[PDB]
C-alpha cells in the first residue's frame, strides 16, 4: 500500500572486517617503574567502565584460528622489541677472541673463566678483561680452550634496556570509532563456530603479552572443563592449544647471587655483565606441585579419549629442536629460564611447603628471541633476589608423524609459534565494521 | 538501551532505539584522555591512524544524509517510490520478523542503485524545483 | 546574596563638607551599578543619585547637584567573578533638613534599580557640641530566683548625637539581650539602656562586664552589674 | 564582534553575537598556508596531531546538534521541559546578570542528564512519531 | 678527552645558524591562548584586562 523509501541512521548492523587497533592500560607502579617495554612512557589509557552490553538473539560465528587480531599482536611486540634498546649501547665491537679454562673446582658448574680484548674509554688504549657468562653463549672453534661467541655469526648484538621491566601488565585492546569487538563469554568452544550469547565490547580483557614456549603464563581461564582450542585436529600435523579450567601455580627462583661489573666500550657507552656468584654452585630451580598437576592431567587424558579414537597408545617427550623450541623458555625477573619438559610426559595412562618437582634449569644471556636476524639482544643479569608470582594458563601440543590407521599415536609438546600463545586470549574476539546507514520502505513520504 | 542493544530485537524495536548506536559510535569509551620524552611510540602511531578510519566511516554516511535532506534528524523519509522488484515482503512483516540484521543482507545488493535514485527525486528534482517555486 | 560594609557614625556642623564611604565585598563590583539615597525626619525619602563603577555615566537630582559630587575606584579581583571596591560621597553646604539616615545600595543587572542595602549611616547635621555617654550599671531586677533566670543590665544616661553601639563582654554575649530604643530628652540629648536575662540564682562566678563605643566622642567606660543588690527580685 | 568578543558581555548580548565564536573556531588565523627535503620535522608532527584534536572538539558537539534537529542553525529550541530542581532563577534574570561564563559552571553537573533527556523528547519520541504520522 | 667518559660526541651542523629568531606559538582550532597584557604581576594571580 504505497511503499516509499525511508532513510534510517544509527542502524545496529555489522560487517565482518579488520581495522588498526590501539592500547588500553591502567596506571601500574606510577612512581618507581614508569616505563616497562610494552606500556612505554605514553600508552593509551583504559576506562574503569567497559561496555558490558550483551546481545540476546545473536549467534554470530566466531573465527578462533583465522582471527586477524592475533597477527596484530604479533607485529606490535616485535616492532617494539626492535625499538626498545635502539638508543642503548651497541655490542658490535665487543665480540673478539676468547681463551679460557673451567672452574677452580672440577665440576662439583656451567660457567667459564673467559679472557678477552675490550676497547676501554680511550680508543687507542686496549685492556684485557675477565667477565662471567652462562652456558651456550659461546661456541668452540679450536693446552688452552680457544673459542668464539654465537652472535658474530648471526646478528649484530646490542645491550638491553636498563631498569626497564621485561614483565607483562594487563594490555587491553581498544577498537576505533565506528567499529566494535565482539566478545564471546560462552562456556564451550569447539575450535571456532557459532556462539550462544555474543556480547559487544569496545575494550577487551586484561591480556598480558605472554613471552614463552611450551607453557602459557597469563590470561583467560574458562571454567568447569578444560577447553580444547582446535585450529586443526583430524590431521595430527597441526598445533593444538588447550585452555585450563583452574590455575596451576608455579614458583621460579635463581639462587645464583651476581654482582655488578661495568666495562666501557669506547666513549660514554657502558656494558654491564655478570660479576661474581656468592655462595654454592646451584641450578636455577623453578619447582612445581606433583599431585596438583596430576589432577589437571586427569581431565586432559580423559578429554583426549573423547576427541581421539578409543584408548590408542599416546605418550612421549619433546622431539628434536634447539634449546628455545623444546624447553619451557620464559622471562622471569629479567633472565630467561630454560627448564625441561621431560618429567611431565613420563606418565603413561589410559583409563582416565609443597612437593619437590623441578626440571633441568639452564640460564642464557645471548637472546635474539623469535630469531632476530638483524638486531640481537643481550639479557642483563639481575642483582640478587629472583621471584615468580606467575601461573600456568595453558599449553601447546603437536603431531605423531603421518601413520596410517594403527594403534600408536604418541602425542608430545611441539608447538613452535608465538601467535598460538595469544590464541588462548583472543579466541573470544572478532572485530566488526559498524554500518549505521539503513534503507527500509514504509507507508510515509515527504511533501512540499 | 545500550550500544547495539537493539540489534537482537526486531526492526520495530530496533528503530525504537537507534540514537545510542550513533552516540557511543564516536566519543564514548574509546576516546579516553589520549595522554624518554616523546609520543612517536607504537601506541601513538596506532591511535592516530585509527582516528582517520574512525571519521571515514562516519563522514561517508554523514555526506549522504546531507544530500537527502535527512541531515537534520536520525529518521527522515524521502519522495522516492519503492520498486516492488527489489523486495516483495509486507511493510509490517519485516519489522517484527526479519530484523535489520538480515534486511541489510537483502538490500546491500541494490543499495548503490537505491542511493543513486535517492539523490535525484528528493534533491536533484525536489530542491531544483525550488529555484522557480520559491518566489511566486 | 552579597554583603555590604557601610562606614558609619560620621557627622558635623552645618555648611561643612561631609564624607561618607562604603566597602563592597563578595560580588563583581565592576558591572554592578551603585545607588545612593537619604531619608528626612518627615518620612519622605529623597533619591540622591545613581553612579556606575565601570563607565562614567551618572544620574543626579537637581537638589543634589552643586552640593553633592560622588567618586568611585577600580575593582580588586579575588576570583574570576568576585571583586572588591569602594564608593565615596561628598556633600557641601548642609542644612538641618539634610539630617537623617543615609544608605548605600547594590545594583541589579530595567537595571538602574537596587537589590541589596547596607547597615545605615545616621547623619546628624547639628551645630551643638558632642557629649560622651554616662555609663551606669543597673541593680538586679524585680523578677525571681526560680531556676536563676532574672534580668540584669546597664543604663546610658546622656550623650549627643546617635548612633551608639553597645555590646556585652566585647562581642561574646549577644543572645538574650534587648536593645532599648534610644530617644531624645527635653534638653535635646539621647538616652538608652540594655537588659540581659541570664540564669542568676545568686551573684557569683559569672560575666557582668559590657562594652560601650562612640566615634565623635570615643568611649571606653565599661561598668559591671551591681553586687550590692537594691531590689527584692534577687532575694526571694 | 570578535572571537569570544561577547564572553565579557551578559548572556543576552552573548547570544546576540555567537557566530564569530564558531567562525574563527576552525580556519581563521590558525589554519595558515601549512607549507634537506622532508616534512617529518618537529613542526610537521605537532601540526597534524593538533589537527586531530581540532576536529575532535568540533565533531563531539556537531554530532549532538545533528541528533537534536538543531543541526540546520546556531540557535534552535527543543520540546524538552525544564525540571525546576536543576535551576531556580528567572529566565530574564541570568540573561542580563549571571552571563554564560558562570551559567556553564551551573549546568555542567546535570549536563549529561540534560543531553540524555534532549535525545528522547525531541528525536527518539518526536521523530519516531513521524513514522506513523507522515502518511494520513 | 672529557667526552669518552660521558657521551658519544658528534660534529655539529655546518652553515646552520645557532641564533634565535621570533618563534610564535599557535594553538589549534577549538582552543585559544589567553594573553595577559597587564601592567603588574604578583607571581601568578587574577588579572585586569585579559585578551
Ligand atoms: C601476569 O601478570 C602479572 C602483572 O602484574 C605478573 O606479575 C609478576 O609479579 C611478581 C610479584 O610482584 C613480580 O616480581 C616482583 O614485583 C615486585 C613489586 O614491587 C613493587 O613494590 C616495590 C616495594 O619494594 C619492596 O618490596 C618488594 C617486593 O617484591 C621487594 O622486591 C623490594 O626489594 C622491596 O622490599 C617497589 O619498589 C617496586 O618498584 C614495585 O612498586 C617488584 O618489587 C620486584 O621488582 C624488583 O625489581 C624491579 C626491576 O625494575 C625493581 O624495579 C623493583 O624495585 C624490585 O627491586 C619484582 O619485579 C614479577 O616480576 C611479575 N612478572 C612475572 C612474569 O612473573 C605475573 O607474573 C604474570 N604471569 C603469570 C600469571 O603467569
Ligand atoms: C584438519 O585437517 C584435515 C586435513 O587432512 C581435514 O580433513 C581432511 O579432509 C580430506 C578431504 O578430501 C580427507 O581426504 C581423504 O581421506 C580419505 C579417507 O581416509 C583418504 O582415503 C584419501 O586419500 C587421498 O590422498 C592420498 C594421499 O595423497 C592419495 O594417495 C589418494 O589417492 C587420495 O587422493 C584422502 O586422504 C583427509 O583424509 C582429511 N583428514 C583426515 C581424515 O585426517 C580436517 O577437515 C581438519 N579438521 C578440523 C575442522 O578440525
Ligand atoms: C678468573 O678467575 C681468576 C682467579 O684466579 C681471576 O683473576 C685473578 O685475580 C686475583 C685477585 O683478584 C689476582 O691475585 C692478586 O693480585 C694482587 C694485585 O694485583 C697481588 O698483590 C696479589 O699478590 C695477587 O697476585 C690474580 O693474579 C688474578 N689472576 C691473574 C693470573 O691475573 C679472573 O679475574 C677471573 N675472571 C674470569 C671470570 O675469567
Ligand atoms: C564443532 O563441533 C560441531 C558439532 O559436532 C561441528 O559441527 C559439525 O560440522 C560438520 C561440518 O563442519 C558436519 O558434517 C556433515 O553433516 C552433514 C549433515 O547432513 C552430512 O551429510 C555430512 O556427511 C557431514 O557429516 C557435522 O554433521 C556437524 N555435527 C554433527 C551433528 O555431526 C563444528 O564444525 C565443529 N567445529 C569445528 C569446525 O571443528
Ligand atoms: C594422580 O595420582 C594419584 C595417586 O597419587 C592417582 O589417584 C588415585 O587414582 C585411582 C584410580 O584413578 C583412585 O582409585 C580409586 O579409589 C577409590 C577410593 O574409594 C575406589 O573406590 C576405586 O575403586 C578406586 O580404587 C584413587 O582413589 C586415587 N588416589 C590415590 C591412591 O592417591 C590419580 O589417579 C593420578 N592421576 C590420574 C591417573 O588421572
Ligand atoms: C618416545 O620415547 C621412547 C623412549 O624409549 C623412544 O623409543 C625408541 O627410540 C629408539 C632410538 O631412537 C628407536 O630406535 C629405532 O628403531 C627402529 C625400528 O625399526 C630402527 O630402524 C632405528 O634404526 C632405531 O633403532 C625406537 O624405534 C623407539 N621406539 C618407539 C617407536 O617408541 C621413542 O623414539 C620416542 N619417540 C619420539 C622419537 O618422540
Ligand atoms: C517476489 O514475489 C514473487 C511472486 O509471488 C516471488 O516469485 C515466486 O513466487 C512463488 C509464489 O507462489 C514461489 O513459488 C513457491 O514455490 C515454493 C516451492 O515449490 C512453494 O513452497 C511456495 O508456496 C511457492 O509456491 C517461487 O519460488 C518464487 N520464485 C522465485 C525463484 O523467486 C519472488 O521470489 C519474491 N521475491 C524475491 C526473492 O525475488
Ligand atoms: C546480490 O544478489 C544476489 C542474488 O542472490 C546475492 O547472492 C548471489 O549469490 C550467488 C550464489 O550464492 C553468488 O555466487 C557466489 O559464488 C562464489 C564463488 O566463489 C561463492 O564463494 C559464493 O558463496 C557464492 O556462491 C553471487 O556472487 C551473489 N551475487 C550476485 C551479484 O549474483 C547477493 O548477496 C546480493 N548482494 C551483493 C552484495 O551483491
Ligand atoms: C531553589 O529555590 C529554593 C527555594 O526558594 C532555594 O532553597 C532555599 O531557598 C531559601 C529562600 O528563602 C534560602 O533561604 C535563604 O537563607 C539565606 C540565609 O539565611 C537568606 O539570606 C535568604 O534571604 C533566604 O532566606 C535557602 O538558603 C535555600 N536553601 C539551599 C541551601 O539551597 C534553592 O537554594 C534554589 N536553588 C538551588 C541553588 O538549588
Ligand atoms: C555538581 O554539583 C555540585 C553541587 O555543589 C558542584 O560542587 C560540588 O562541590 C563540593 C564542595 O565544593 C565538591 O567537593 C570537592 O572536594 C574536593 C576534595 O579534594 C575539593 O578539591 C574541591 O574543591 C571540592 O571542595 C564536589 O566534588 C562538587 N561536586 C559534586 C558532584 O558534589 C559541582 O560543580 C557540580 N558540577 C560537576 C561538574 O560535578
Ligand atoms: C600577589 O599579591 C596579592 C596581594 O597581597 C596576594 O593576595 C593575598 O593572598 C593571601 C593568600 O594567598 C591572603 O592571606 C590571607 O588573608 C585572609 C583574609 O581574611 C586572612 O584571614 C589570612 O590569615 C591570610 O592573611 C592575603 O590577605 C592577600 N592579600 C592581602 C590583602 O593581604 C596574592 O596571593 C599574591 N600572589 C602570590 C600567591 O604570590
Ligand atoms: C688480548 O690481547 C693480548 C695482547 O698481548 C693477547 O695476548 C697474546 O695472545 C696470543 C694468542 O691469542 C699469544 O700468541 C701471545 O703470545 C699473547 N701474548 C702474551 C702477553 O703472552 C690476549 O690473549 C688477548 N686476549 C683475547 C682472548 O682477546
Ligand atoms: C553469556 O551469558 C551469560 C548469562 O547466561 C552472561 O553472564 C553475565 O554477564 C554479566 C555481565 O555484566 C555479569 O555481570 C553476570 O554476573 C554474568 N552472569 C554469570 C554469573 O554468568 C555473559 O555476560 C554472556 N556472555 C558475554 C559474551 O558476555
Ligand atoms: C649475596 O650474598 C652476599 C653475602 O652475604 C650478600 O652480601 C652482603 O651485601 C650487603 C649490601 O650492602 C653488605 O652490607 C653485606 O656486608 C654483605 N655481606 C657480605 C659479608 O658479603 C649480598 O647481599 C648477596 N646478594 C645481593 C646481590 O644482594
Ligand atoms: C590591557 O588594557 C589596555 C588598555 O588599558 C590594552 O591596551 C591597548 O591594546 C591595544 C591592542 O590593539 C593597542 O592597540 C593599544 O595601543 C593599547 N593601548 C595602550 C597604549 O596601552 C591592552 O591591549 C590590554 N591587555 C591585553 C591583554 O591585550
Ligand atoms: C657461524 O657463522 C658462520 C658464518 O657462515 C657459519 O659458517 C657457521 O656454521 C656458524 N655456526 C655454527 C653452526 O657453528
Ligand atoms: C611455592 O609457592 C607456593 C604458593 O605460594 C607456596 O605456598 C610455597 O610455600 C612455595 N614454596 C616454598 C618455598 O615452600
Ligand atoms: C671519566 O669517566 C670515568 C669512567 O667511569 C670516571 O671514572 C671518571 O671519574 C670520569 N672523569 C673524571 C671525574 O675525572
Q: Which residue on chain A is closest to B47 by alpha carbon?
A: A22
For chain E, say whether A126 makes contact (Cβ under 8 Å).
no
For chain E, say whether A267 makes contact (Cβ under 8 Å).
yes
Q: Alpha-carbon distance B83 to A5, whole Å?
A: 10
In a shared domain, residues C107 and C180: no
Answer yes or no: are the C-beta atoms of A5 and B92 closer than 8 Å: no
Of A79, A80, A435, the CB nearest to B104: A435
For chain B, say whether A200 makes contact (Cβ under 8 Å).
yes
Q: Which residue on chain E is closest to A90 by alpha carbon?
A: E8
In a shared domain, residues C122 and C10: yes
Contacts 24+ apart (CB under 8 A), C67-76: C67/C91, C67/C92, C67/C93, C67/C94, C68/C92, C70/C36, C72/C34, C75/C28, C75/C29, C75/C30
The pocket around ligand 14, CB under 6 angstroms, is made up of A 257, 278, 383-384
Task: List C-alpha distances in Å: A431 to A17, A48, A179, A199, B47.
Answer: 6, 21, 7, 12, 16
Count of CB pairs separated by less than 8 Å, A with E: 22
In a shared domain, residues C139 and C53: no
- How many Cβ atoms sit within 10 Å of the Cβ of residue E3? 11
Method: X-ray
Q: Alpha-carbon distance A429 to C54, whole Å?
A: 64
In a shared domain, residues C30 and C107: yes
- Report helix, strand or coil for D94: helix
- How many Cβ atoms sit within 10 Å of the Cβ of residue B93? 10
Q: Kind of pairing, strands A156-159 and A375-378?
A: parallel
Count of CB pairs separated by less than 8 Å, A with D: 13
Show the CA angle centred on residue D12, arms to residues D10 and D16, nearest 5°.
Answer: 110
For chain D, say whether E26 makes contact (Cβ under 8 Å).
yes
In a mutational test of the E interface, the residue from C29, C54, C77, C85 whose CB has the highest number of chain E CBs within 10 Å is: C77
- Cβ contact, residue pair C81, D93, below 8 Å: no
Query: In sequence order, what DSSP letters do the residues of chain B get, joined into one string?
Result: --TTTTSSS-HHHHTTS-SHHHHTTSSSSSS-------S-SHHHHHHHHHHHHHHHHHHHHHHHHHTTT-TTSSEEEEEEEPPTTT--S-HHHHHTTTHHHHHHHHHTTTHHHHHHHHHIIIIITHHHHHHHHS--
C-alpha cell at C7: 562606614
Q: Alpha-carbon distance A387 to A389, whole Å?
A: 7
Q: How would you label D30-69 residue by residue, b for 16+ Cβ within 10 Å and e otherwise?
A: beeeeeeeeeeeeeeeebebeebebbbeebeeebeebbbb
CA-wise closest residue to B76 among B67, B86, B89: B67
CA-wise closest residue to A263 among A254, A272, A255: A272
N- to C-terminal Cα separation, chain B: 48
CATH of the domain at C231: 2.60.40.10
Answer yes or no: are the C-beta atoms of A277 and A132 closer than 8 Å: yes
In a shared domain, residues C117 and C135: no
C-alpha cell at E21: 629568531
In a shared domain, residues C43 and C87: yes
- Last-in-domain residue among C89, C112, C127: C127
CA-wise closest residue to A239 among A61, A411, A410, A425: A411
Å from CA of A216 to ligand 17 middle: 20
Show the CA angle centred on residue A189, arms to residues A184 and A190, nearest 5°.
Answer: 140
Query: In sequence order, what DSSP letters do the residues of chain E get, joined into one string?
Result: -HHHHH----PPPTT---S---------TT--PPPB--S---SS---SSB-
- Cβ contact, residue pair A122, E7, below 8 Å: no
In a mutational test of the A interface, the residue from B22, B42, B119 whose CB has the highest number of chain A CBs within 10 Å is: B42
Contacts with C162 (C-beta within 8 Å, 6 or more apart), sequence order: C122, C124, C182, C190
Note down the domain range covering C62. 1-127
Show the CA angle centred on residue A414, arms to residues A411 and A417, nearest 5°.
Answer: 140
Answer yes or no: are the C-beta atoms of A170 and A153 closer than 8 Å: no
The pocket around ligand 9, CB under 6 angstroms, is made up of C 1; D 88
For chain B, say whether D65 makes contact (Cβ under 8 Å).
no
Number of structural domains chain B divides into:
1
Q: Do chains E and B touch (3 or more CB pairs under 8 A)?
A: no
Q: Is E40 close to ligand 15, i.e. is its CB under 6 Å away?
A: no
Task: List C-alpha distances in Å: D87 to C111, D11, D106.
Answer: 22, 16, 8
Answer yes or no: are the C-beta atoms of B72 and D69 closer than 8 Å: yes
Backbone angles phi, psi at A154, to 5 degrees: -65, -45
Residue recorded with cell 557641601: C92
- Last-in-domain residue among C127, C151, C170: C127
Please name the residues between 89 and 108 in chain D that touch chain C, using a CB distance below 8 Å: 93, 96-97, 101-102
Prior bond of B35 cis (ω within 30°)? no
Beta bridge partners of A203: A174
CA B101, B105, B107, B108 dihedral sign is: positive
- Last-in-domain residue among C97, C127, C157: C127
Q: Alpha-carbon distance A224 to A200, whole Å?
A: 24
Backbone angles phi, psi at C225, to 5 degrees: -50, 130
Contacts with A16 (C-beta within 8 Å, 6 or more apart), sequence order: A430, A432, A433
- How many Cβ atoms sit within 10 Å of the Cβ of residue C16? 12
Please name the residues between 1 and 51 in chain E that touch chain C, using a CB distance below 8 Å: 46-48
Contacts 24+ apart (CB under 8 A), C59-64: C59/C112, C64/C91
Q: A286: burial class by Cβ within 10 Å (0-12, 13-18, 19+)?
A: buried
For chain A, say whether D130 makes contact (Cβ under 8 Å).
yes
- Report helix, strand or coil for A246: coil
Q: Is A98 close to ligand 3, i.e. is its CB under 6 Å away?
A: no
Q: Alpha-carbon distance A215 to A328, whole Å?
A: 6
Residue recorded with cell 511503499: A3
Beta bridge partners of C77: C83
Note down the domain range covering B35. 1-132
Q: Alpha-carbon distance C103 to C121, whole Å?
A: 6
Answer yes or no: are the C-beta atoms of D134 and A445 closer than 8 Å: yes
Supply the Cα-derived Rg of chain C in whole angstroms. 22
Q: Alpha-carbon distance D85 to D83, whole Å?
A: 5
What size, in residues, is chain A?
A: 448
Q: Alpha-carbon distance A296 to A247, whole Å?
A: 9
- How many Cβ atoms sit within 10 Å of the Cβ of residue A32? 8
Backbone angles phi, psi at D117, to 5 degrees: -75, -30
- How many Cβ atoms sit within 10 Å of the Cβ of residue E25? 5
Q: Alpha-carbon distance C48 to C30, whole Å?
A: 21
- The DSSP element (H or E) to which A303 belongs, if any, is helix A291-307
Q: Alpha-carbon distance C106 to C27, whole Å?
A: 10
- Taking every pair of Cα atoms in chain E, the longest distance, rounded to a whole number of angstroms, is 56
From the CA of E1, the nearest ligand is: 18
C-alpha cell at A360: 633441568
- Report helix, strand or coil for A147: strand
Task: List C-alpha distances in Å: B71 to B61, D58, D66.
Answer: 10, 17, 7
Beta bridge partners of A25: A45
CA-wise closest residue to D54 among D78, D39, D75, D32: D32
Answer yes or no: are the C-beta atoms of A275 and A258 closer than 8 Å: yes
CA-wise closest residue to D31 among E24, B56, E26: E26
- Report helix, strand or coil for D107: helix
Min distance E50 CA to chain A CA atoms (Å)? 34
Supply the Cα-derived Rg of chain A in whole angstroms. 26
Q: Alpha-carbon distance A54 to A71, whole Å?
A: 27
Answer yes or no: are the C-beta atoms of A202 and A50 closer than 8 Å: yes
Of D49, D55, D127, the CB nearest to B74: D127
- Report helix, strand or coil for A365: coil
Q: Alpha-carbon distance C143 to C201, whole Å?
A: 11
- Cβ contact, residue pair A9, B61, below 8 Å: yes
**Given the CA of residue A258, which atom of ligand 14 is nearest to it?**
27
Q: Which residue on chain D is closest to B44 by alpha carbon?
A: D49
Residue nearest ligand 16's atom 14 by CA: A139
- The DSSP element (H or E) to which A431 belongs, if any, is strand A429-434
C-alpha cell at C2: 552579597
Contacts with E45 (C-beta within 8 Å, 6 or more apart), sequence order: none
Residues of chain D with C-beta less than 8 angstroms from the C-beta of C109: 10, 93, 96-97
- Cβ contact, residue pair D131, B27, below 8 Å: no
Å from CA of C16 to ligand 4 middle: 113
Q: Is E43 close to ligand 11, i.e. is its CB under 6 Å away?
A: yes
Q: Alpha-carbon distance C180 to C197, whole Å?
A: 14
Contacts with A313 (C-beta within 8 Å, 6 or more apart), sequence order: A407, A408, A409, A410
- The DSSP element (H or E) to which A5 belongs, if any, is strand A4-9
Q: Do chains C and B touch (3 or more CB pairs under 8 A)?
A: no
Q: Alpha-carbon distance C134 to C132, whole Å?
A: 7
Please name the residues between 58 and 97 in chain A that touch chain B, using a CB distance below 8 Å: 58, 76, 79-80, 83, 87
- Taking every pair of Cα atoms in chain A, the longest distance, rounded to a whole number of angstroms, is 105
Resolution reading in Å: 4.8
For chain E, say whether A279 makes contact (Cβ under 8 Å).
no
Residues of chain C with C-beta less than 8 angstroms from the C-beta of D96: 109, 111
Number of structural domains chain C divides into:
2
Contacts 24+ apart (CB under 8 A), A117-124: A118/A94, A118/A263, A118/A265, A118/A271, A119/A93, A119/A265, A119/A266, A120/A263, A120/A264, A121/A264, A121/A266, A121/A267, A121/E4, A121/E5, A122/E4, A123/A266, A123/A267, A123/E4
Q: Alpha-carbon distance C137 to C224, whole Å?
A: 6
Amino acid at each position: 500500500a504505497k511503499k516509499w523509501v525511508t532513510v534510517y541512521y544509527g542502524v545496529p548492523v555489522w560487517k565482518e572486517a579488520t581495522t588498526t587497533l590501539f592500547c588500553a592500560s591502567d596506571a601500574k607502579a606510577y612512581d618507581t617503574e614508569v616505563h616497562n617495554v610494552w606500556a612505554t612512557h605514553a600508552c593509551v589509557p583504559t576506562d574503569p567502565n567497559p561496555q558490558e552490553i550483551v546481545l540476546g538473539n545473536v549467534t554470530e560465528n566466531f573465527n578462533m584460528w583465522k582471527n586477524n587480531m592475533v597477527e596484530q599482536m604479533h607485529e606490535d611486540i616485535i616492532s617494539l622489541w626492535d625499538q626498545s634498546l635502539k638508543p642503548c649501547v651497541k655490542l658490535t665491537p665487543l665480540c673478539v677472541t676468547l681463551n679460557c679454562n673451567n672452574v677452580n673446582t672440577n665440576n662439583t658448574g656451567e660457567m667459564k673463566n673467559c679472557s678477552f680484548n675490550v676497547t676501554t674509554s680511550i680508543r687507542d688504549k686496549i685492556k684485557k678483561e675477565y667477565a662471567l657468562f652462562y652456558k651456550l653463549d659461546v661456541v668452540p672453534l679450536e693446552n688452552i680452550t680457544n673459542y668464539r661467541l654465537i652472535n658474530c655469526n648471526t646478528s649484530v648484538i646490542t645491550q638491553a634496556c636498563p631498569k626497564v621491566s621485561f614483565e607483562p601488565i594487563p594490555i587491553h585492546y581498544c577498537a576505533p570509532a565506528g567499529f566494535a569487538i565482539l566478545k564471546c563469554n560462552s562456556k564451550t568452544f569447539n575450535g571456532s563456530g557459532p556462539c550462544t550469547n555474543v556480547s559487544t565490547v569496545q575494550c577487551t580483557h586484561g591480556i598480558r603479552p605472554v613471552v614463552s614456549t611450551q607453557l602459557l603464563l597469563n590470561g583467560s581461564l574458562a571454567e568447569e572443563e578444560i577447553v580444547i582450542r582446535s585450529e586443526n585436529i583430524t590431521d595430527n600435523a597441526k598445533t593444538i592449544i588447550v585452555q585450563l579450567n583452574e590455575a596451576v601455580e608455579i614458583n621460579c627462583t635463581r639462587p645464583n647471587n651476581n654482582t655488578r661489573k661495568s666495562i666501557h666500550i669506547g666513549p660514554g657507552r657502558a656494558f654491564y655483565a655478570t660479576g661474581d656468584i656468592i655462595g654454592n654452585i646451584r641450578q636455577a630451580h623453578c619447582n612445581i606441585s606433583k599431585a596438583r598437576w596430576n589432577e589437571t592431567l586427569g581431565q586432559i587424558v580423559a578429554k583426549l579419549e573423547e576427541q581421539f579414537p578409543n584408548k590408542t597408545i599416546i605418550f612421549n617427550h619433546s622431539s628434536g629442536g634447539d634449546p628455545e623450541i623444546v624447553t619451557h623458555s620464559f622471562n622471569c625477573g629479567g633472565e630467561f629460564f630454560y627448564c625441561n619438559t621431560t618429567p611431565l610426559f613420563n606418565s603413561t595412562w589410559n583409563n582416565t611447603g609443597e612437593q619437590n618437582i623441578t626440571l633441568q634449569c639452564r640460564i642464557k644471556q645471548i637472546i635474539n628471541m623469535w630469531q632476530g636476524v638483524g638486531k640481537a639482544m643481550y639479557a642483563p643479569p639481575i642483582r640478587g633476589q629472583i621471584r615468580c608470582s606467575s601461573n600456568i594458563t595453558g599449553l601447546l601440543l603437536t603431531r605423531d608423524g603421518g601413520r596410517d590407521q594403527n594403534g600408536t599415536e604418541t602425542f608430545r609438546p611441539g608447538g613452535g609459534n608465538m601467535r598460538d600463545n595469544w590464541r588462548s586470549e583472543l579466541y573470544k574476539y572478532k572485530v566488526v565494521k559498524i554500518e549505521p546507514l539503513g534503507i527500509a520502505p514504509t507507508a510515509c513520504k515527504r511533501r512540499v | 538501551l545500550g550500544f547495539l542493544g537493539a540489534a537482537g530485537s526486531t526492526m520495530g524495536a530496533a528503530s525504537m532505539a537507534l540514537t545510542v548506536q550513533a552516540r557511543l559510535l564516536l566519543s564514548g569509551i574509546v576516546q579516553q584522555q589520549n595522554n624518554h620524552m616523546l609520543q612517536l611510540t607504537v601506541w601513538g602511531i596506532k591511535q592516530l591512524q585509527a582516528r582517520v578510519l574512525a571519521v571515514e566511516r562516519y563522514l561517508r554516511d554523514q555526506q549522504l544524509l546531507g544530500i537527502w535532506g535527512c541531515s537534520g534528524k536520525i529518521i527522515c523519509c524521502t519522495n522516492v517510490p519503492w520498486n516492488d522488484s527489489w523486495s516483495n515482503k509486507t511493510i509490517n512483516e519485516i519489522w517484527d520478523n526479519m530484523t535489520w540484521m538480515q534486511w541489510e543482507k537483502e538490500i546491500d545488493n541494490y543499495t548503490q542503485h537505491i542511493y543513486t535514485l535517492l539523490e535525484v527525486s528528493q534533491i536533484q528534482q525536489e530542491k531544483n524545483e525550488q529555484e522557480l517555486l520559491e518566489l511566486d | 546574596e552579597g554583603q555590604l560594609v557601610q562606614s558609619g557614625a560620621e557627622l558635623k556642623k552645618p555648611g561643612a563638607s561631609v564624607k561618607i564611604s562604603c566597602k563592597t565585598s563578595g560580588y563583581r563590583f565592576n558591572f554592578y551599578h551603585i545607588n545612593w539615597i537619604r531619608q528626612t525626619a518627615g518620612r519622605g525619602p529623597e533619591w540622591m543619585g545613581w553612579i556606575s563603577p565601570y563607565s562614567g555615566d551618572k544620574n543626579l537630582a537637581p537638589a543634589f547637584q552643586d552640593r553633592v559630587i560622588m567618586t568611585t575606584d577600580t575593582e580588586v579581583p579575588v576570583t574570576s567573578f568576585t571583586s572588591t571596591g569602594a564608593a565615596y560621597m561628598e556633600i557641601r553646604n548642609l542644612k538641618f533638613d539634610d539630617t537623617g539616615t543615609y544608605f548605600c545600595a547594590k545594583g541589579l543587572l530595567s537595571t538602574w534599580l537596587p537589590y541589596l542595602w547596607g547597615q545605615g549611616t545616621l547623619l546628624t547635621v547639628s551645630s551643638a557640641s558632642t557629649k560622651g555617654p554616662s555609663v551606669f550599671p543597673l541593680a538586679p531586677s524585680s523578677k525571681s530566683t526560680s531556676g536563676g533566670t532574672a534580668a540584669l543590665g546597664c543604663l546610658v544616661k546622656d550623650y549627643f548625637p546617635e548612633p551608639v553601639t553597645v555590646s556585652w563582654n566585647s562581642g561574646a554575649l549577644t543572645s538574650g539581650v534587648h536593645t532599648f530604643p534610644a530617644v531624645l530628652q527635653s534638653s535635646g540629648l539621647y538616652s538608652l539602656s540594655s537588659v540581659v536575662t541570664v540564669p542568676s540564682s545568686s551573684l557569683g562566678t559569672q560575666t557582668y562586664i559590657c562594652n560601650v563605643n562612640h566615634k565623635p566622642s570615643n568611649t571606653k567606660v565599661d561598668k559591671r552589674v551591681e553586687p550590692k543588690s537594691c531590689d527584692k527580685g534577687l532575694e526571694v
